[PDB]
Symmetry: C2
Subunit: 224 residues, 2 copies
């Protein structure tokens, strides 16, 4: 939690006057958003934020960070967001907090895409963290059954017994896959599944990973 | 028109007592739904319908066909739906009426999936009809621009000036591709596009196409 804050704050250093800046979601990106808001008020930093979720929108508006829709910009200069897992090939799993779909839409349109994480998110192979898959409401139960038949071990995302509904009005089914030896293939295969909106594998996307740990902060370059 | 009704009734002959039946839309498929409703009213037929559109839900409720969602049954035995285009390899363009997402969800779950159309929907190559592409609201305009830059001639689906919101709360962008000589590759490419929920290429799905004729064409499948 203190490590999550050092990572989110450090990332705010990559933001400059005149940037369009993607604003991530989740307990680590939250510190980055806070810090961007702090620089906008103390320094007069001139940015325009583009959101990745309704929670982030509310947080940015409270902080006074000016906002525009992804629709209203042609590209995003820098986006900082968290990750549930990051492998050594700079593929990740995202969506633990429910906002994978808008996070992938903004990440795809980002020139310098940065993840912030604590040391515990660096894994040798993706998959111990259940893969979030955003799914159409209509026919989701039939889809869940198909995923059970395939051995993906699904569960609906729910909080306090309430089935989770995303910002774009879908559900999430998490897949207990254990290990994803070829996340490119597996993402591309999930892309052909009718009833799947988006999934949480972010492959070949991130440019820089900022890792805060007990020993200090490491800045890991993907070098595409 | 008389032939379309004969074709829609002929497709209802695949429906038997005790089936779960998908109920679609289309200039010819409308007659198939009327005929199921008549067999329920007049011949004691016992079925459960699963519709692809809220216009068919109203139609079926007027006729007293009992309905359920796709989530409340195990398998759909027979689905009859329309199509905007069907090619000689039994791929098709659907979604001209806006219902592509529920049509594809119901189609995927169907054991005997039938399209019933008239001759003008049979084409040599798909593409003269605009391809519907159902898209996530957030970033839809930027995606429109990307499709424009790729030469796909997009237009947002709108009615009376109002951008169309699909049943699952997305927009549609129709692409004027002209000709889609490899619909499998094109659908694959859309399926990878971040921001696309679904698209109107139904490839390798349909079992049988019934054409006003009346002719019954069997797909490989």
């Amino acid at each position: 939690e203190e490590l999550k804050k050092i990572a989110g704050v450090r990332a705010a250093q990559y933001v400059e006057d005149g940037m369009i800046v993607g604003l991530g979601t989740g307990s680590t990106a939250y510190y980055f958003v806070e810090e961007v808001g702090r620089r906008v008020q103390e320094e007069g930093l001139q940015v325009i934020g583009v959101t990745t979720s309704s929670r982030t929108t509310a947080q940015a508006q409270a902080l006074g960070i000016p906002l525009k829709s992804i629709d209203e910009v042609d590209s995003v200069d820098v986006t900082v967001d968290g990750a549930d897992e990051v492998d050594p090939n700079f593929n990740g799993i995202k969506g633990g907090g429910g906002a994978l779909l808008m996070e992938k839409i903004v990440g795809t349109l980002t020139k310098d895409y940065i993840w912030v994480v604590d040391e515990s998110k660096m894994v040798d192979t993706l998959g111990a963290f259940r893969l979030p898959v955003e799914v159409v409401q209509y026919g989701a139960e039939r889809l869940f059954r198909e995923f059970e038949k395939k051995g993906y071990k699904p569960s609906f995302r729910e909080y306090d017994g309430v089935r989770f509904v995303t910002d774009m009005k879908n559900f999430i089914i998490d897949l207990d896959l254990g290990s994803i030896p070829d996340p490119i293939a597996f993402g591309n295969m999930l892309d052909h599944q009718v009833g799947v909106v988006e999934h949480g594998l972010f492959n070949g996307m991130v440019n820089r990973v900022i890792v805060a740990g007990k020993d200090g902060v490491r800045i890991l370059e993907a070098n595409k």
